Amino acid sequence: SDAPPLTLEAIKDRVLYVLKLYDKIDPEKLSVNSHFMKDLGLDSLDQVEIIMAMEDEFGFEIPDIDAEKLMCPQEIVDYIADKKDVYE
Amino acid sequence: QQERDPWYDWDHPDLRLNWGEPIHWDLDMYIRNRVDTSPTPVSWNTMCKHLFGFVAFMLFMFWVGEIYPSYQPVGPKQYPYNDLYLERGGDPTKEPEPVVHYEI
Amino acid sequence: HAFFKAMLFMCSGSIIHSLNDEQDIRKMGGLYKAMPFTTTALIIGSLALTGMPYLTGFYSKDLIIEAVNMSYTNAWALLMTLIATSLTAAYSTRIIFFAFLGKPRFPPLVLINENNPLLINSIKRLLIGSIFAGFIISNNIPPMTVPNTTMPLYMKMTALIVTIMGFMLALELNNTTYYLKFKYPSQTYKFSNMLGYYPSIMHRLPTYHNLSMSQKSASS
Amino acid sequence: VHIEPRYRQFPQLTRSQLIQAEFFSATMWFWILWRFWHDSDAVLGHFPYPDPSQWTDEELGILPDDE
Amino acid sequence: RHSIFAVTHVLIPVWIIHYYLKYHVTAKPYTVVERKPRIFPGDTILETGEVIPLMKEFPDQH
Amino acid sequence: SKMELPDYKQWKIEGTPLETVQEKLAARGLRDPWGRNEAWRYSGGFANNVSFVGALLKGFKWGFAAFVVAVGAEYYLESQ
Amino acid sequence: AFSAPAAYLTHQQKVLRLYKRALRHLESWCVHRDKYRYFACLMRARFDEHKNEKDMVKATQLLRQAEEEFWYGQHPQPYIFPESPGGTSYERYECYKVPEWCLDDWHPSEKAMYPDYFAKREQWKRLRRESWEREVKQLQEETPPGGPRTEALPPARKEGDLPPLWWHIVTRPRERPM
Amino acid sequence: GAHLARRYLGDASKEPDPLRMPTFPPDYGFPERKEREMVATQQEMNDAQLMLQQRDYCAHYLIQLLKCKRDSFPNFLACKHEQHDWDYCEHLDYVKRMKEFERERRLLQRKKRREQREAEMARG
Amino acid sequence: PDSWDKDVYPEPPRRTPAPAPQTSLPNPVTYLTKIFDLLVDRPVTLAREFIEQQHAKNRYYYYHREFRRVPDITECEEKDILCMFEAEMQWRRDYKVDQEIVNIIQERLKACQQREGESYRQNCAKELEQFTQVSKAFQDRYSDLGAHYSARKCLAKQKQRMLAERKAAKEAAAA
Amino acid sequence: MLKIIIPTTMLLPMTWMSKHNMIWINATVHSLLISLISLSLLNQLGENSLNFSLTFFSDSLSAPLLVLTTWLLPLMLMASQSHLSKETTTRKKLYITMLILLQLFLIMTFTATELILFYILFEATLVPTLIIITRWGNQTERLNAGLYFLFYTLAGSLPLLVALVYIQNTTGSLNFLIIHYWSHPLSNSWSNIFMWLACIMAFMVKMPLYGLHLWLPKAHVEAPIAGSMVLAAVLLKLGGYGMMRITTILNPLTNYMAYPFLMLSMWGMIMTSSICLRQTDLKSLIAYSSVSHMALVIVAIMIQTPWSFMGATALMIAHGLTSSMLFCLANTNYERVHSRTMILARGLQTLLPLMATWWLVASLTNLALPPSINLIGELFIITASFSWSNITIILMGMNMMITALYSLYMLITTQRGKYTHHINNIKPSFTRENALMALHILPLLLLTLNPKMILGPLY
Amino acid sequence: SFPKYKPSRLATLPATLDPAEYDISPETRKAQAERLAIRSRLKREYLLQYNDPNRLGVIEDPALIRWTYARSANIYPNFRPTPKTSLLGALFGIGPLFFWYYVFKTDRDKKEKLIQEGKLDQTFNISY
Numbered sequence A: 001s002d003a004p005p006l007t008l009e010a011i012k013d014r015v016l017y018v019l020k021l022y023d024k025i026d027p028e029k030l031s032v033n034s035h036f037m038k039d040l041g042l043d044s045l046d047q048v049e050i051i052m053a054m055e056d057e058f059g060f061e062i063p064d065i066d067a068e069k070l071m072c073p074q075e076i077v078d079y080i081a082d083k084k085d086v087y088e
Numbered sequence B: 001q002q003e004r005d006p007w008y009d010w011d012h013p014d015l016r017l018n019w020g021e022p023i024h025w026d027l028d029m030y031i032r033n034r035v036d037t038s039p040t041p042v043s044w045n046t047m048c049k050h051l052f053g054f055v056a057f058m059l060f061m062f063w064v065g066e067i068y069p070s071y072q073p074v075g076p077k078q079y080p081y082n083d084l085y086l087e088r089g090g091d092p093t094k095e096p097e098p099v100v101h102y103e104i
Numbered sequence C: 001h002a003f004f005k006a007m008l009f010m011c012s013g014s015i016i017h018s019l020n021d022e023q024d025i026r027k028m029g030g031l032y033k034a035m036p037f038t039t040t041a042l043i044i045g046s047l048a049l050t051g052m053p054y055l056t057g058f059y060s061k062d063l064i065i066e067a068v069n070m071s072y073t074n075a076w077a078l079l080m081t082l083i084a085t086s087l088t089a090a091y092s093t094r095i096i097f098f099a100f101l102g103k104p105r106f107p108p109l110v111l112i113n114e115n116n117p118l119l120i121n122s123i124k125r126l127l128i129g130s131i132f133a134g135f136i137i138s139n140n141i142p143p144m145t146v147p148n149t150t151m152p153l154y155m156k157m158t159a160l161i162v163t164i165m166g167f168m169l170a171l172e173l174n175n176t177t178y179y180l181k182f183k184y185p186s187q188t189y190k191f192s193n194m195l196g197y198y199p200s201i202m203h204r205l206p207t208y209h210n211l212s213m214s215q216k217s218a219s220s
Numbered sequence D: 001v002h003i004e005p006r007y008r009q010f011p012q013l014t015r016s017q018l019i020q021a022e023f024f025s026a027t028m029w030f031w032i033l034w035r036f037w038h039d040s041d042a043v044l045g046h047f048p049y050p051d052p053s054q055w056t057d058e059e060l061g062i063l064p065d066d067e
Numbered sequence E: 001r002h003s004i005f006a007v008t009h010v011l012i013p014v015w016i017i018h019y020y021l022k023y024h025v026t027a028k029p030y031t032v033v034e035r036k037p038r039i040f041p042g043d044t045i046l047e048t049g050e051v052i053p054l055m056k057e058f059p060d061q062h
Numbered sequence F: 001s002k003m004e005l006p007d008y009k010q011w012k013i014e015g016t017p018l019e020t021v022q023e024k025l026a027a028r029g030l031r032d033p034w035g036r037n038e039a040w041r042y043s044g045g046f047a048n049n050v051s052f053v054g055a056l057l058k059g060f061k062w063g064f065a066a067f068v069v070a071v072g073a074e075y076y077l078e079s080q
Numbered sequence G: 001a002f003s004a005p006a007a008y009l010t011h012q013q014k015v016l017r018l019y020k021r022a023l024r025h026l027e028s029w030c031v032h033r034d035k036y037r038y039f040a041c042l043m044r045a046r047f048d049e050h051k052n053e054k055d056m057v058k059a060t061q062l063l064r065q066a067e068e069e070f071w072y073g074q075h076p077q078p079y080i081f082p083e084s085p086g087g088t089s090y091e092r093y094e095c096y097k098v099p100e101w102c103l104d105d106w107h108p109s110e111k112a113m114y115p116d117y118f119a120k121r122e123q124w125k126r127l128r129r130e131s132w133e134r135e136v137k138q139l140q141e142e143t144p145p146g147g148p149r150t151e152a153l154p155p156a157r158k159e160g161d162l163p164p165l166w167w168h169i170v171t172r173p174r175e176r177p178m
Numbered sequence H: 001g002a003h004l005a006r007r008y009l010g011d012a013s014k015e016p017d018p019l020r021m022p023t024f025p026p027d028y029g030f031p032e033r034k035e036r037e038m039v040a041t042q043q044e045m046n047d048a049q050l051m052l053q054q055r056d057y058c059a060h061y062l063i064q065l066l067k068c069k070r071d072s073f074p075n076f077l078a079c080k081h082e083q084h085d086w087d088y089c090e091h092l093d094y095v096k097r098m099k100e101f102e103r104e105r106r107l108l109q110r111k112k113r114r115e116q117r118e119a120e121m122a123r124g
Numbered sequence I: 001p002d003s004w005d006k007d008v009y010p011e012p013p014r015r016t017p018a019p020a021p022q023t024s025l026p027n028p029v030t031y032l033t034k035i036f037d038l039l040v041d042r043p044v045t046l047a048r049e050f051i052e053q054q055h056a057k058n059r060y061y062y063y064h065r066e067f068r069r070v071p072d073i074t075e076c077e078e079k080d081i082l083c084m085f086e087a088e089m090q091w092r093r094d095y096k097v098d099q100e101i102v103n104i105i106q107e108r109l110k111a112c113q114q115r116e117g118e119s120y121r122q123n124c125a126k127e128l129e130q131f132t133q134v135s136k137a138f139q140d141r142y143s144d145l146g147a148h149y150s151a152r153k154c155l156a157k158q159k160q161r162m163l164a165e166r167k168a169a170k171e172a173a174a175a
Numbered sequence J: 001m002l003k004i005i006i007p008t009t010m011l012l013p014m015t016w017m018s019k020h021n022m023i024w025i026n027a028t029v030h031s032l033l034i035s036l037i038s039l040s041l042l043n044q045l046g047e048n049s050l051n052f053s054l055t056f057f058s059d060s061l062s063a064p065l066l067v068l069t070t071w072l073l074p075l076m077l078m079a080s081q082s083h084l085s086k087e088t089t090t091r092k093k094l095y096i097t098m099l100i101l102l103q104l105f106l107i108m109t110f111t112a113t114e115l116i117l118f119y120i121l122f123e124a125t126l127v128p129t130l131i132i133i134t135r136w137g138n139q140t141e142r143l144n145a146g147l148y149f150l151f152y153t154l155a156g157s158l159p160l161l162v163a164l165v166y167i168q169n170t171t172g173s174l175n176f177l178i179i180h181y182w183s184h185p186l187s188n189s190w191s192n193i194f195m196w197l198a199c200i201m202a203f204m205v206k207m208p209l210y211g212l213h214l215w216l217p218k219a220h221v222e223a224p225i226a227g228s229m230v231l232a233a234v235l236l237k238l239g240g241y242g243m244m245r246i247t248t249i250l251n252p253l254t255n256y257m258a259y260p261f262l263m264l265s266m267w268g269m270i271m272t273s274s275i276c277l278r279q280t281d282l283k284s285l286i287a288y289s290s291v292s293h294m295a296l297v298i299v300a301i302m303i304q305t306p307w308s309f310m311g312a313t314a315l316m317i318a319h320g321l322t323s324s325m326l327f328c329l330a331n332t333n334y335e336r337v338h339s340r341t342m343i344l345a346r347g348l349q350t351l352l353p354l355m356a357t358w359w360l361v362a363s364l365t366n367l368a369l370p371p372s373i374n375l376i377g378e379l380f381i382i383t384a385s386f387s388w389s390n391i392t393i394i395l396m397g398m399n400m401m402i403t404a405l406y407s408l409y410m411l412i413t414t415q416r417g418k419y420t421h422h423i424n425n426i427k428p429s430f431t432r433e434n435a436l437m438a439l440h441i442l443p444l445l446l447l448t449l450n451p452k453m454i455l456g457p458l459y
Numbered sequence K: 001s002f003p004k005y006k007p008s009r010l011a012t013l014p015a016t017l018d019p020a021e022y023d024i025s026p027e028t029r030k031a032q033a034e035r036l037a038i039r040s041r042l043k044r045e046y047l048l049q050y051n052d053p054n055r056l057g058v059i060e061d062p063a064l065i066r067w068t069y070a071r072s073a074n075i076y077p078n079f080r081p082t083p084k085t086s087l088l089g090a091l092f093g094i095g096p097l098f099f100w101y102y103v104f105k106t107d108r109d110k111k112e113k114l115i116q117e118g119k120l121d122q123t124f125n126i127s128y
């Protein structure tokens, strides 16, 4: 009836979907462990935009202190998974 | 306590206090179930002016409209039996002043 | 009013449940086709609420307006009642415009589902009520009121005219939002949106003074 | 009844709810039209408003300005 | 058991109240007072049989 | 459960007012890199929506037809 | 909520916070998505107009003027996520969160139900007991003699070690305990 | 409404006061006035328990309507002729009140005019 | 019912109109009332008749207590405690009886207002008249004694009122 | 009346000759039996009291107080046997002896026919309570609390002894029946003003009157649970009973000598209700509630009207029961967290739901929810004060608002919000505490069905 | 440029509008570092007892004890009779009493004067 039991792979797929719907990142080089600063050549404002896109994607807010630390898609997936109490 | 950072991991989350830190003298008045001092989008002394002006203007215009009411161009309603003298209380032992209404 | 206002709340709760506890209309998009029964019920409720002719609200609210027009009345109260009648249609239009028309503004995971018999039947009962109860009741209770049989034509249609003007003005100002133009809010908007600053003042000044005198003076 | 989420696609609708919504909207409009056809005076008025100016002085008893 | 709810929740409570009202509330005066029935010109009273006369030769503005 | 995500290459801002916004920005020397993320709200069943007066007149056709047939029946039957 | 805060915010952090806040409030003002895209691109242009200045005084003055701009032009009713500190569902489920130590007060008849879960809980309690002194020793080793300077905690450096002060972080009740 | 606009903005002494009314004798300008008739007696209105504000000169039609509603109870759409008759009598009462208002107004503005005109004659 | 004296609690002759249907549709309340009469009223009547049959097998009476009339406070000396006690008890009983009389008149007034309907203002002038006179008498009797009231204080109030009346008549006859 | 006094006296040899593991059972069972016997005193007449003998009598005002006093001892025994577990047998028996002596003194006080015996027992009640507070109290402030409690009462009531002795010399007797039958007015003299003052302040101190209540927040907080229950439930009502008894001699001097006391009480209810809004201690809040409620009884007694007297009796009974229940509820939490701060243990509805229900019921009863007997008494007094002066309604309504405000504040602070993370020793509610709550609350609701039993002789 | 926001008692100044955070000194940074050190030490001291498996009791908070003691027991020892103290005490203690006494005395005097002339319409007033 309610929302399905969100899993790890679904979170990863949605994060990568949102990331590859972004024009400053190409889909052919985007990886799960590909950092935004050193690997994909982006500045801090683009990182804030990415965090905001993830927030609108999953429908919940990420605190600013926490958001700055994230730098690769794996970090975002792990943060969301631990925040939403997802283990499988 | 509403102004304290809600994203900090306090020892007491609902009170928004840490364990060993000193406690304000008026904590029980600022428990955020109570008096709030958080900044507002509109400044004080401007909220007060607008609210007071609205209330005073409404009262003044209500008084003015009481001075100048709105009605219809009709005569007073007419009731048959001595203006319903018996039905409005009775007192049938005085033979009141007979009021008479005519067709116009 | 009981019928259609309770139905309006049930429709709003159905919307809230179907959008994962989201209550802001700014994150509600195109639900006219996504939730057809909720849209039908809320359209009928808004029409009843706005005193649409022959709706359950027509048998009470329009007669109220007529009585206020045909009485020895405070003129400011009369004008305020008419402006409130227009603002009813104004706000009703806003709920429909920001909730049911346009493109979606909710998160991409679509969990919308109104195919539950309990919700449907509960809304449908008061839908039938909001449609027919005014006619059923108003023609069945004995007359305890002398009517306003003679009225000028322009005053007989005051409520309908003001509701129509409210609809048109609110729709125009809402359609203005699509334009690619940005401007900072005026002071009238801030007064209206912050509830006239009444909670911003009366929930802080008297409470603070009472709680401070209770301790500084009475206790200490 | 069991429908599924769709993730950026229009939700899957059943045949029942569309029929019910159309039926009830049509019922409301039919009721409005029927009542206006049978109770037009409840909206447009039934008794015409008389013009006070049209009334003569003979009806209301006004003297010819001098006695 | 098909209609058991309507017996223990509707019929039983109204049995007690009707008994309570018929023999214990009306045993004392003025406990249950009913508004006087409206009498219109032309009705017949069940208690006395008298007929209320018609209402005085209408002006007939028809 | 066990449902798949749509292909991400089907999201294009073409035809949608996102293209108009992109052109207004290109007239200034800027680009919008998130249009395809928002493009899903304009493509499928959300492509077209009714207007306010068209929403109010949701069931006018069926109601009008029923009213016409009912009034015609009652008019042609009461001729007793 | 998960990271130990620093002593102060740097200029970059303040500018990023202001950028995110201004974008959120502009989205609140711009309800529709394409208009928000247009004005958010304009906002990004306005922020990038001054990203390369090497003078800190003028940058700080620009930041002050930007904060005044935001406070004058902010939305009185900004959008808040439902589970956010200002949301309509912020603390809705805090009365359903029961701490784990309440399970030790159950009757033996209640623990007759769910035997396997209580066996797992017992081995979890044994694991918690067996590691406390090592955590205390690591904490008192890796901190400066004049008290800690930051709230950040160290990880487990050896192989048989668990991160110090982990029990109440690992055994959180849930977001949706019922 | 224009009557309020003329009274509040124009001369207030040229139009009647709704509360202080009428200010002229009922037979001041009329040769003969037939006193208004009441069909329903006091006892009939008492036994019908209409209401105190419903015991006007239209009470007989109201009694008709109440009786017709009572006898044809399940058919709650049959008492239309009596409803129309009662509403027509109410409309007649209202237009009679309008006639009283207009007579009051024009005698009131005529008295002032003639008094000040024969005052204009007495200027010398 | 004969459980109460119908002159202490008067009741109008209860005129009700005849059912004169003028339509052809069935009356739903008639069928509902028939169902009520045959479904709930009859079993209750049967149960009550069984209870009355049980009661008829055991009949006993309780008697209203009657009190003699003892000398009142005016016939008692200043410090005669026994006569004072008996007079005070008799005064308390009379006070309770007066309160119950006022209750009877108030009950009539309430019943009358509801029974008459919408014409109550003119319909029951008599009940209002009866209550006004009874209230005036009860006030002149017991209005301002306050707590710790006694027969002596009521006697003092009566004496003061009699002195006032005598003086009023004194200067009334001098005119 | 000896059929109640003699069993209460026999409670002492039974307590002392009991085995160390059977004292509580015997005491509770026989106290409950004595309460059941005392229930027979509610059968009052309509005109005069029940003159058992030359020494004792019973009226419609003494009977509810006697029933409450007899019913309270089992509850004090129930609430005391938790924190006295580690005591020695002799000390437990001494505590029970003090409680039994207190009951016996109160029982003989509420039925004393003369004012001198009434004074003797009314002051004999001081030594057991003083011993309880200063011996079985928990903190170091119990000595100061005992000193305050003793000296306020004695300083207020020694002039009462002098005045009573003078009255007997001038009148010949102090028997209440003779005084009531042979009543005579006071001339408006300075000597009569001071004799009025001497006969009144002895009971104003124990109500307590506003400004004379300083001893109460000390004595009710420092005392153990049983001491606090008996202080709040019965010992505050001695002043009201004495005032309603002794205003017979006082009239008509009361018509104008009551102005300062009426002003003090009607402003002090506001002051104490406002004090209750900022209290860091729960027990102190419950104690100030008592002053706020008893100011209304002072008003009702001082205005001298039958409706005020009936409302005062009902309010005294209801306040006794409600205050005892609230004190027990606070003690249940104190025995868990070993502190009296209100914000220490919070969110207790999640942990103890049935205690949360008990807290809700007690809070609803405190704020005079209809149709509680609290409401009956308070509304009767409010109507009497409105008849006295219409402007009293402002103060009465403001007091009703503030009472509900602080009652629901106390409920929400303790039972709502999130539970403190570190208090991990909150064991489930015992059967004894739940039974205590039920035995406190059931009589309150049951008395709503027959409110004439607690409306006094003016009914 | 835009209209300026001015703080008040119940609507305080936001941090982003406070000039002190835009004119920073090494003294301020040292102060912030020491404040964070104090908070971190207190947090560590709390969490060491909080996470201890062995302890089964409420953790004592000296700050709460200090707060309650200062608010309740520490007031009189630090009380001095001063002009402001005496004036405020006399006013808040005595003024309301005489105000209400005057109001009630005038009201009851008026009512008694009306009684003695038989003008209150006291019919149906029985229960008083």
Ligand SMILES: CCCCCCCCCCCCCCCCCC(=O)OC[C@H](COP(=O)([O-])OCC(O)COP(=O)([O-])OC[C@@H](COC(=O)CCCCCCCCCCCCCCCCC)OC(=O)CCCCCCCCCCCCCCCCC)OC(=O)CCCCCCCCCCCCCCCCC
Pocket (backbone or CB within 6 Å): B049, B050, B052, B053, B054, B057, C082, C083, C086, C087, C090, C161, C162, C165, C166, C169, C170, C173, C174, C183, C184, C185, C186, C187, C188, C189, C190, C192
């Ligand atoms: C029948 C014959 C008679 C005919 C009668 C007249 C015929 C038609 C006339 C039509 C006239 C215009 C009607 C529309 C009005 C304006 C609409 C509007 O919203 O414009 C927006 C515009 C600016 O908006 P914004 O800030 O840019 O909005 C930002 C976003 O767009 C925010 O966007 P958003 O998404 O938040 O949406 C905002 C929302 C909300 O919009 C607003 O923010 C403004 C809402 C408030 C104004 C609404 C009108 C209410 C008027 C009530 C007046 C009562 C008296 C108050 C007295 C107070 C005294 C202090 O928009 C709407 O609600 C829709 C507009 C209103 C819909 C209803 C309009 C129709 C009803 C009114 C006309 C009735 C016609 C029939 C009448 C029949 C009987 C006569 O403001 C106005 O135009 C209204 C200003 C008028 C009031 C000014 C009051 C003075 C304030 C300062 C005074 C000096 C104080 C000095 C200090 C004193 C201290 C003591």
Ligand SMILES: CCCCCCCCCCCCCCCCC[C@@H](O)O[C@H](CO[C@H](O)CCCCCCCCCCCCCCC)COP(=O)(O)OCC[N+](C)(C)C
Pocket (backbone or CB within 6 Å): J188, J189, J190, J193, J209, J210, J211, J212, J257, J260
């Ligand atoms: C902290 C609170 C604790 C409780 C306090 C209780 C308060 C007790 C006070 C009781 C009030 C009545 C006492 C005296 C009665 C009237 C006082 C005076 O103001 O009345 C006038 C009296 O005039 C003068 O004021 C004389 C009194 C002057 C001496 C008294 C000064 C008291 C001021 C401060 C009192 C402090 C009380 C607390 C002590 C610790 C009336 O004038 P007059 O009609 O001609 O005389 C009537 C008396 N007769 C009939 C016997 C002849």
Ligand SMILES: CCCCCCCC/C=C\CCCCCCCC(=O)O[C@H](COC(=O)CCCCCCC/C=C/CCCCCCCC)COP(=O)(O)OCCN
Pocket (backbone or CB within 6 Å): J151, J152, J153, J155, J156, J159, J162, J163, J166, J190, J191, J192, J194, J195, J196, J197, J198, J201, J205, J212
């Ligand atoms: C916790 C604080 C409470 C303190 C209360 C103290 C005040 C009590 C009230 C006054 C107490 C003393 C009154 C005397 C006892 C009654 C005696 C009596 O009634 O007889 C009078 C005696 O009258 C007196 O002698 C009065 C003496 C008063 C002197 C002591 C004054 C003490 C202070 C008075 C004010 C205190 C009252 C209120 C204070 C409240 C607390 C602040 C009649 O005298 P006769 O001999 O008959 O002469 C007339 C015929 N020839």
Ligand SMILES: CCCCCCCCCCCC(=O)SCCNC(=O)CCNC(=O)[C@H](O)C(C)(C)COP(=O)(O)O
Pocket (backbone or CB within 6 Å): A042, A043, A044, A045, A046, G011, G012, G013, G015, G016, G022, G025, G026, G046, G047, G050, G051, G052, G053, G059, G060, G062, G063, G066, G067, G069, G070, G073, G074, G075
């Ligand atoms: C309601 C609507 C509110 C609108 C009002 C607000 C509008 C403000 C517009 C102007 C903003 C300014 O001047 S803000 C001034 C911006 N420039 C500086 O601060 C100087 C050095 N620049 C940097 O450090 C980087 O650009 C940095 C930004 C940190 C990112 O970089 P990373 O990410 O690589 O780290």
